[PDB]
């Protein structure tokens, strides 16, 4: 299945993933396309920040679900 990603500049991209992919896989696949290292990334789907170690299925996100890429203006 393919999900949507609104990247750091607001660009919508597409990602071909399988729901049994883990979040670290998605951050790796995001690094592949938009070139951002996986550890600096936060991914926010439908309000719930996805955390490392759980499954893309554990958040119940499917085709045409949009992931939001942000960094940390960590003050």
Cβ 54 to another protein, closest distance in Å?
Answer: 10
Q: How many helices (H) and strands (E) does the chain have?
A: 1, 5
User: Whose Cβ is closer to another protein: residue 37's or residue 58's?
Assistant: 37
Query: Which residues contribute to the site for another protein (CB under 8 A)?
Result: 2, 4, 6, 8-10, 12-14, 35-37, 40, 42, 44, 46-49, 51, 63-64, 66, 68, 70-75
Q: Phi/psi of residue 28, each to 5°?
A: -70, -45
Cβ proximity to another protein: between 25 and 36 the closer is 36
Between residues 25 and 68, which has the closer beta carbon with respect to another protein?
A: 68
In sequence order, the 6+-apart residues with CB closer than 8 A to the CB of 67 are 3, 4, 5, 6, 15, 26, 43, 44, 45, 50, 61
């Amino acid at each position: 299945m393919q999900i949507f990603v609104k990247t750091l500049t607001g660009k919508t991209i597409t990602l071909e993933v399988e729901p049994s992919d883990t979040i670290e896989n998605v951050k790796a696949k995001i690094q592949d396309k938009e070139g951002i290292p996986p550890d600096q990334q936060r991914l926010i789907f439908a309000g719930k920040q996805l955390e490392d170690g759980r499954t893309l299925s554990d958040y119940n996100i499917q085709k045409e679900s949009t992931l939001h890429l942000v960094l940390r203006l960590r003050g």
